[PDB]
């Protein structure tokens, strides 16, 4: 009837950070040894970490040696781990699970699992923006839509910076899909529409992307 | 049990003016209270705690007064750097209550929004979704309500909103709302609309266009 | 300079979990009470939870008691907030911040503060699921594809259970959109592909969606 | 210290005794230990110290061995016992696992049939177009497929999806789904699957013409 609970799973881009933990049911965890371990795809599994008790030493299989952090707290009766600038081989299920007590034993098996969560680390940390138009039909309004693009910022500036007067480019905002989104606008006078072209340049560094998009009356 | 109640929610001032922000509190709480400077995107800084203690580094034009459930934060000069969200906190023991933050702003007049909207574009609604933009220009105050109409039907959900901070020029704001639909229950509707209440406007103002212009 | 850093923040589903953590720099957390406070749309700060020297005592905004768990890691200077069942109104900018110690004061605010991170609750708790043909073209097979669906289960039956021999429903992978997606596939005799009609007929519990999809030859 | 296990899938009856062999690189004494783990499950500790059993497993599993050499025997194999088992060598501050032994049900070899999906012309007007590959009814599970797409070898664009083994016939049925962008599928016009399996004494090619 001992049980073990882990939380905190999830889809993560490469380079990012994730945070698990752990209860229990039927137990206390102070007097024992508590683990970290993953199930790799492919069915091998992989001791991840150890917290002791009274945390008198905290243990790392080398491959998280420096971006792993195991932590416990035995008055609620949680482990947790926190995981940083995570690759694509940490794509795994993550266990916890219990050793017997370190204060009465120098070498004992896991004996208590917890069922798993589930941990997906996409290889792709950068994705560039999508440019769309925002065509105009005395003073009109044209502007560009930048969409899709991971992480923040990208950069707009119009004609290559020839043309500022008026430009409002907006907080970009996260989308449900976990990409950002964001427009550029400006105003001119409505008789330059026909003499004048209007190009919106993006610059988005984290994936190495530039896009000029011409913005005319459709 | 203590709420604390800010007065008032948008103060706007010129550079060189001394500013008062008072905070109210529901209960006696002495002296246990602090005040703290925020900009947008940064963390909150403290300038005064025990309702009149400046703490060390912060300009002496900034100084705080009152007690029991009155309190006044009191800015003398106003420079261009104090523009900013300004919180009022009452700290206990184990736990604190904050005021709704009130945010100090460069004065100028009132400006009704310029709106406009825009079309998805081909290439996008191929792609597969409809993204439909609604831009409300150089208004102020900042406050405005954007509401979708698709075939006369009012939208709910499915619609997300930004704002530009004031201009450096002339102290306006923008409001972007951008409509995501399918492109299949994009092209099953004709009429798409977007409607805008602003309080220097006497009626709401619509602007729209038939699907296939 | 005296230094807190969060991490942990990132996008999640209604009704999700999500844990951060606050490490610090340049002072040690044992002496301070720690506490959570989150930036609301609107503008205003929000107290949400704290957690008192030697975990004493933890406390908690009414909006989230019985949902949020705060913990501290005295030994290497952590403190962790986990979220469980989360709402759209949990939608915030989330720091972590001390509480001010003296030997000459009991009482003090909060002097210091990290940056903050992002933390944003999806309002759809569930998705309903896409039901697409796998087109037939001796033994013949056809299918149905089931796509961006949340969360798991889905069920696959075939004309409303009368078909059952030589079917094969696969395990539901996960995309890289978040959303799970499955096919079902039979294996038919190729003479019954005029005769016999197939209907294959997705039940999606979470979100109540139900989807009948007849797979035909294609021409 | 590395350990490895022998066989990596080891095919057989009910009724069997079978034995799974743990190999340590060094001597790692008696600290070790054997788990059983069903797909979708939490592993579960069977035999400790080598040779102790843990309270509540069957009789039927006994473990031995020391130094560098070890055992797991399995007296009187069960459905139930149709699973993966791992070996691990465990100290007080370091733990390594083996790679895993499948234990399947054996049967004959059986060459998968092979079928091909072009995606949906709703799905392509949607804007995604998802290619579906089918490996029916084949033994044992290994198998590679690959994608090609004008001739042109396809990477990271495709996940797969395995059923367990067959209650009546014991074999194996796979998916390979290769997911592409409305844009990215009209440049192009032949799309296949190649599938390699023990059962097919050449690799065999299913493919279409987009648009016919």
């Known amino acids: 009837e001992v049980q073990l609970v882990e939380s905190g799973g999830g889809l993560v881009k490469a380079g990012g950070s994730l945070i698990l933990s752990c209860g229990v049911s039927?137990?206390?965890?102070?007097?024992?040894?508590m683990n970290w371990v993953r199930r790799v795809p492919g069915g091998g599994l992989e001791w991840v970490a150890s917290?002791?008790?009274?945390?008198?030493?905290?243990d790392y299989a080398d491959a998280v040696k420096g971006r792993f952090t195991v932590s416990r707290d035995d008055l609620e009766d949680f482990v947790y781990l926190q995981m940083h600038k995570m690759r694509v081989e940490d794509t795994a299920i993550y266990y916890c699970?219990?050793?017997?007590?370190?204060?009465?034993?120098?070498?004992?098996?896991?004996?208590?699992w917890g069922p798993g969560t589930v941990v997906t680390v996409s290889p792709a940390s950068t994705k560039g923006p999508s440019v769309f138009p925002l065509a105009p039909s005395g003073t009109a309004a044209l502007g560009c839509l930048v969409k899709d693009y991971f992480p923040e910022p990208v950069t707009v500036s119009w004609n290559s910076g020839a043309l500022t007067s008026g430009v409002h480019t907006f907080p970009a905002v996260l989308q449900s899909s976990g990409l950002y989104s964001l427009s550029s606008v400006v105003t001119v006078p409505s008789s330059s529409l026909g003499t004048q072209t209007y190009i919106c340049n993006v610059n988005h560094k984290p994936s190495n992307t530039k896009v000029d998009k011409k913005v005319e009356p459709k | 049990d203590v709420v604390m109640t800010q007065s008032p929610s948008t103060l706007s001032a010129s550079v060189g003016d001394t500013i008062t922000i008072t905070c109210?509190?529901?209960?006696?709480?002495?002296?246990?209270?602090?005040?703290y400077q925020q900009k947008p995107g940064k963390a909150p800084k403290l300038?005064?705690?025990?309702?009149?203690?400046?703490?060390t580094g912060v300009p002496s034009r900034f100084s705080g007064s009152g007690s029991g459930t009155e309190f006044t934060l009191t800015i003398s000069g106003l420079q261009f750097d104090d523009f900013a969200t300004?919180?009022?906190?009452?700290?206990?023991?184990?736990?604190?209550?904050?005021?709704?933050g009130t945010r100090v702003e460069i004065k100028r007049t009132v400006a009704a929004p310029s709106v406009f909207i825009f079309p998805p574009s081909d290439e996008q609604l191929k792609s597969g979704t409809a993204s439909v933009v609604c831009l409300l220009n150089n208004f102020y105050p900042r406050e405005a309500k954007v509401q979708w109409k698709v075939d006369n039907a009012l939208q709910s959900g499915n619609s997300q909103e930004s704002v530009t901070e004031q201009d450096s020029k002339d102290s306006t704001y923008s409001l972007s709302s951008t409509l995501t639909l399918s492109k299949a229950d994009y092209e099953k509707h004709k009429v798409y609309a977007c409607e805008v209440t602003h309080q220097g406007l006497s009626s709401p103002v619509t602007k729209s266009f038939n699907r296939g212009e | 300079e005296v230094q807190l850093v969060e991490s942990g923040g990132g996008l999640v589903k209604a009704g999700g979990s999500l844990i951060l953590s606050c490490?610090?720099?340049?002072?040690?957390?044992?002496?301070?009470?720690?506490?959570?406070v989150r930036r609301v749309p609107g503008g205003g700060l929000e107290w949400?939870?704290?957690?008192?020297?030697?975990?004493?005592?933890?406390?908690?905004?009414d909006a989230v008691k019985g949902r949020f768990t705060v913990s501290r890691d005295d030994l290497e200077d952590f403190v962790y907030l986990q979220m469980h069942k989360m709402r759209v109104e949990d939608t915030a900018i989330?720091?972590?911040?001390?509480?001010?110690?003296?030997?000459?004061?009991?009482?003090?605010?909060?002097?210091?503060?990290?940056?903050g991170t992002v933390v944003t609750v999806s309002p759809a708790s569930t998705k309903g699921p896409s039901v697409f043909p796998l087109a037939p073209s001796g033994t013949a097979a056809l299918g149905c594809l089931v796509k961006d669906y949340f969360p798991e289960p889905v069920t696959v039956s075939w004309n409303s259970g009368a078909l059952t021999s030589g079917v094969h429903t696969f395990p539901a992978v996960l995309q890289s959109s978040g959303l799970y997606s499955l096919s079902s596939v039979v294996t038919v005799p190729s003479s019954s592909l005029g005769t016999q009609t197939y209907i294959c007929n997705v039940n999606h519990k979470p979100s109540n969606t139900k989807v009948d999809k007849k797979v035909e030859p294609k021409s | 210290v590395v350990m490895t296990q022998s066989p990596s899938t080891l095919s057989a009856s009910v009724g069997d005794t079978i034995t799974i062999t743990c190999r340590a690189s060094?001597?790692?004494?008696?600290?070790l230990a054997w788990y059983q783990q069903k797909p979708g499950k939490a592993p579960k500790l069977l035999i400790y110290?080598?040779?102790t059993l843990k309270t509540g497993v069957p009789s039927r599993f006994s473990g031995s061995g020391s130094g560098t050499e070890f055992t797991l025997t399995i007296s009187g194999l069960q459905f139930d016992d149709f699973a993966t088992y791992h070996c691990?060598?465990?100290?007080?501050?370091?733990?390594?696992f083996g790679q895993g032994t499948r234990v399947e049900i054996k049967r004959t070899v059986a060459a998968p049939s092979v079928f091909i999906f072009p995606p949906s012309d709703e799905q392509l007007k949607s804007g995604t177009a998802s290619v579906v590959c089918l490996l029916n009814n084949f033994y044992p599970r290994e198998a590679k497929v690959q994608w090609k797409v004008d001739n042109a070898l396809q990477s990271g664009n495709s996940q797969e999806s395995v059923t367990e083994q067959d209650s009546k016939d014991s074999t194996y049925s796979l998916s390979s789904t290769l997911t592409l962008s409305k844009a990215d599928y009209e440049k192009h016009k032949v799309y296949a699957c190649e599938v390699t399996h023990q059962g097919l004494s050449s690799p065999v090619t299913k493919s279409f013409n987009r648009g016919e």
């Open positions: 039927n137990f206390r965890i102070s007097a024992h040894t």
């Open positions: 060094q001597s790692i004494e008696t600290w």
């Open positions: 691990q060598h465990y100290a007080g501050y370091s733990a390594t």
């Open positions: 917290i002791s008790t009274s945390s008198t030493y905290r």
């Open positions: 110290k080598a040779s």
């Open positions: 699970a219990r050793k017997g007590s370190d204060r009465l034993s120098d070498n004992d098996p896991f004996d208590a």
